[PDB]
Amino acid sequence: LDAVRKRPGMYIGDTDDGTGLHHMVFEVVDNAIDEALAGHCKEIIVTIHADNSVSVQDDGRGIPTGIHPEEGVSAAEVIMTVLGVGVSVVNALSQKLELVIQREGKIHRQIYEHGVPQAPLAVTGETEKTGTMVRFWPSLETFTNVTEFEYEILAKRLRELSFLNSGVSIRLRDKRDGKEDHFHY
Amino acid sequence: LDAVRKRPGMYIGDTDDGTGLHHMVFEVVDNAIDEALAGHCKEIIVTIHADNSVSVQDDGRGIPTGIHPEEGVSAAEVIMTVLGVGVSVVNALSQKLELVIQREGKIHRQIYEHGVPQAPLAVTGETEKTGTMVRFWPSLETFTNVTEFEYEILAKRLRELSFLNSGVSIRLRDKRDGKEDHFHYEGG
Ligand SMILES: COC(=O)/C=C/c1ccc(O)cc1
Numbered sequence: 616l617d618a619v620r621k622r623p624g625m626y627i628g629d630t631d632d633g634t635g636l637h638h639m640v641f642e643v644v645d646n647a648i649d650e651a652l653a654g655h656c657k658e659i660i661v662t663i664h665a666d667n668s669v670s671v672q673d674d675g676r677g678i679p680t681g682i683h684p685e686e687g688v689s690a691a692e693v694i695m696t697v698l699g700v701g702v703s704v705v706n707a708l709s710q711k712l713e714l715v716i717q718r719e720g721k722i723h724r725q726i727y728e729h730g731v732p733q734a735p736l737a738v739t740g741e742t743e744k745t746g747t748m749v750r751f752w753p754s755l756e757t758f759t760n761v762t763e764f765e766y767e768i769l770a771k772r773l774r775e776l777s778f779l780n781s782g783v784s785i786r787l788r789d790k791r792d793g794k795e796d797h798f799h800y
Numbered sequence: 801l802d803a804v805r806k807r808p809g810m811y812i813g814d815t816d817d818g819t820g821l822h823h824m825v826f827e828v829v830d831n832a833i834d835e836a837l838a839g840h841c842k843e844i845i846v847t848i849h850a851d852n853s854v855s856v857q858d859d860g861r862g863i864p865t866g867i868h869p870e871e872g873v874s875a876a877e878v879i880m881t882v883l884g885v886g887v888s889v890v891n892a893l894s895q896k897l898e899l900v901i902q903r904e905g906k907i908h909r910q911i912y913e914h915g916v917p918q919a920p921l922a923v924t925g926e927t928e929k930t931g932t933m934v935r936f937w938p939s940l941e942t943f944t945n946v947t948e949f950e951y952e953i954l955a956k957r958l959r960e961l962s963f964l965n966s967g968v969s970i971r972l973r974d975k976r977d978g979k980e981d982h983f984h985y986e987g988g
């Protein structure tokens with residue numbers, strides 16, 4: 616991930632005019648949408664939190680949690696730390712990243728800072744649901760000038776996605792001012 | 801560098817009792833002494849700055865600055881970012897690291913934050929001297945509880961080291977209070 620950290624613009628887009636910032640959301644969304652396709656109901660929820668983080672929940676099968684045979688860590692971790700641009704890029708450029716995977720009756724959690732895992736992916740409880748949730752706080756060492764999520768920028772792109780991913784429900788919620796939308800084609 | 805960041809303890813030692821913190825200094829010093837040893841006048845200057853960074857200056861030949869054939873960046877950057885424990889470990893666990901290399905008539909400068917280079921190594925100017933200066937600000941996200949350098953721990957070690965390195969002048973300066981020491985042993 617150091618290659619992403621040293622030239623973030625080359626991976627995510629302009630880091631000063633809001634371009635890169637928004638592309639962080641879109642990259643997570645692309646992954647989430649593909650999760651939703653493969654598991655009944657087929658809905659994602661994109662939230663702009665008051666603290667300027669964005670979360671993206673899917674009702675998919677859950678990113679795989681088992682130990683990757685070659686890397687020695689969970690498969691989810693491999694995905695978050697090893698170089699569509701990939702979610703590893705978002706993680707690398709995030710001051711904090713929270714990951715919650717619901718899979719095979721189990722809740723798994725892991726926290727990252729600037730792409731470094733704080734601990735291994737751990738089972739924290741039981742659940743009847745499946746899905747993946749990623750909340751990230753964009754690093755303010757990378758993202759300058761435009762540092763706040765703009766609702767309409769996210770809305771425009773998600774609208775386009777709904778048409779292209781038919782049957783996938785896309786919800787957008789803004790906790791700063793209560794704005795919400797529901798794209799479903 | 802991510803392997804270090806992931807488990808800092810395994811590389812630098814204990815990040816909570818001051819051991820690791822001071823080990824950062826010693827690792828740099830070891831490299832500096834190796835540099836000073838290859839030159840003739842042989843001097844190193846260790847300074848504790850008032851912002852709790854430490855700088856180490858040597859009058860060696862300067863860390864090589866040419867682009868590394870396979871890595872695609874200057875040799876200095878390869879040394880600072882590709883993993884005693886290696887200076888790359890110090891860089892990784894430093895919130896800021898300033899690198900100044902005087903070599904082949906030219907001053908070279910680069911800044912790192914948490915091991916990440918802010919720009920490629922750049923020729924900023926000219927010089928008649930040679931040497932390598934590294935100044936680092938320990939990461940307070942890594943180093944907890946003991947976060948300030950204790951002059952006495954540095955002095956004791958630098959005094960011991962001076963006996964093992966004949967001809968090498970080691971100066972210790974604390975800009976917080978003005979304390980200075982000069983350890984120079986001529987043996988051999
Ligand atoms: C298993 O396939 C993958 O790489 C999935 C990645 C992924 C899924 C959801 C998300 O919010 C971010 C990343």
Ligand SMILES: COC(=O)/C=C/c1ccc(O)cc1
Nearest residue numbers: 828831832856879887932934
């Ligand atoms: C080939 O040299 C190396 O690997 C490292 C050299 C070096 C590191 C720190 C310092 O203050 C001076 C020199």
Ligand SMILES: Nc1nc2ccccc2[nH]1
Nearest residue numbers: 728729731756805914941
């Ligand atoms: N890799 C890395 N980059 C960082 C930037 C700020 C704080 C901690 C960090 N760790």
